[PDB]
């Protein structure tokens, strides 16, 4: 019943690409989350016959699949859109490793007429996850290694902060800008350089400069997703960054942060 299971069971998919749907399955509580909606993970076998092998549920909103999908086997004629993608509101999209479209998933959510009534935060966290989306699709989301990367990383509610092509924050949500705060910051977020703003605060001047040479890698291309642990003027913050990058081009990055002072005691 896990994925290791269900892809060994109805698949016949390379070690490469079984890596990559764990990693995909490891990251996309973040995905959920921002795009407030359920998805599921399905995989074509040679039968053509469709198995969901994942399913994750928004913490963000409330969910539309309240039974369990995982395991269930169903025919390509009843999912024609599903099918036809290997070559509540339902949107379905490729999930790419090399050169072969290896999963697909399928994205459930409230119909337009009554969900959550948008905010910036809500409009920032949709934009981002149709980012993801796009890059699961190019096959660009998840990379380095084939792994989840960590137990402890921060949820996108804890803070979120997108930064533009030139390292200027465009959007910071009111926990990002919290936690920013604890750091010394006593200025806004929005509308200034990230590197400028965050060095200063970093206290000890070897992660200062890793923050700022790992910020710099990530506003160039060659740059891979970092967590870091930083202290910064009596606060502990978890930082987790996420290179944007649709058909080719840098779009920018997603930097999620949470207050860990506490935790850390």
Same mark, same amino acid.
């Given at each position: 019943?896990?994925?290791?299971?269900?892809?060994?069971?109805?698949?016949?998919?390379?070690?490469?690409?079984?890596?990559? +749907?764990?990693?995909?399955?490891?990251?996309?509580?973040?995905?959920?989350?921002?795009?407030?909606?359920?998805?599921?993970?399905?995989?074509? /076998?040679?039968?053509? &016959?469709?198995?969901? &092998?994942?399913?994750?549920?928004?913490?963000?909103?409330?969910?539309?699949?309240?039974?369990?999908?995982?395991?269930?086997?169903?025919?390509?004629?009843? *999912?024609?859109?599903?099918?036809?993608?290997?070559?509540?509101?339902?949107? &379905?999209?490729? &999930?790419?490793?090399?050169?072969?479209?290896?999963?697909?998933?399928?994205?459930?959510?409230?119909? +337009?007429?009554?969900?959550?009534?948008?905010?910036?935060?809500?409009?920032?966290? /949709?934009?981002?996850?149709?980012?993801?989306? /796009?890059?699961?699709?190019?096959?660009?989301?998840?990379?380095?290694?084939?792994?989840? *990367?960590?137990?402890?990383?921060? /949820?996108?509610? #804890?803070?979120?902060?997108? +930064?533009?092509?030139?390292?200027?924050?465009?959007?910071?949500?009111?926990?990002?800008?919290?936690?920013?705060?604890?750091?010394? +910051?006593?200025?806004?977020?929005?509308?200034?350089?990230?590197?400028?703003?965050?060095?200063?605060?970093?206290?000890?001047?070897?992660?200062?400069?890793?923050?700022?040479?790992?910020?710099? #890698?990530?506003?160039?291309?060659?740059?891979?997703?970092?967590? *870091?642990?930083?202290?910064?003027?009596?606060?502990?913050?978890?930082?987790?960054?996420?290179?944007?990058?649709?058909?080719?081009?840098?779009?920018?990055?997603?930097?999620?942060?949470?207050?860990?002072?506490?935790?850390?005691?």
């Amino acid at each position: 019943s896990t994925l290791g299971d269900l892809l060994a069971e109805h698949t016949v998919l390379p070690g490469s690409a079984v890596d990559h +749907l764990h990693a995909v399955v490891g990251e996309w509580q973040l995905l959920a989350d921002l795009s407030f909606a359920d998805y599921l993970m399905w995989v074509r /076998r040679d039968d053509g &016959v469709l198995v969901c &092998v994942a399913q994750c549920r928004p913490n963000t909103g409330p969910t539309v699949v309240h039974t369990d999908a995982v395991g269930t086997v169903v025919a390509a004629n009843s *999912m024609p859109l599903v099918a036809a993608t290997f070559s509540h509101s339902v949107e &379905v999209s490729p &999930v790419r490793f090399g050169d072969q479209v290896v999963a697909v998933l399928t994205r459930h959510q409230p119909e +337009l007429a009554a969900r959550r009534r948008s905010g910036h935060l809500e409009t920032a966290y /949709r934009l981002c996850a149709t980012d993801l989306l /796009r890059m699961l699709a190019e096959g660009t989301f998840p990379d380095a290694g084939d792994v989840a *990367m960590s137990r402890s990383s921060p /949820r996108a509610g #804890d803070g979120f902060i997108r +930064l533009d092509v030139d390292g200027v924050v465009s959007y910071a949500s009111p926990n990002a800008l919290s936690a920013y705060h604890r750091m010394g +910051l006593t200025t806004e977020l929005e509308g200034v350089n990230l590197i400028d703003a965050t060095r200063p605060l970093i206290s000890d001047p070897f992660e200062a400069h890793e923050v700022d040479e790992h910020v710099q #890698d990530l506003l160039a291309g060659d740059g891979k997703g970092m967590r *870091m642990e930083v202290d910064a003027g009596g606060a502990t913050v978890l930082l987790r960054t996420l290179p944007l990058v649709v058909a080719g081009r840098n779009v920018g990055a997603a930097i999620l942060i949470r207050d860990v002072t506490e935790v850390k005691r």
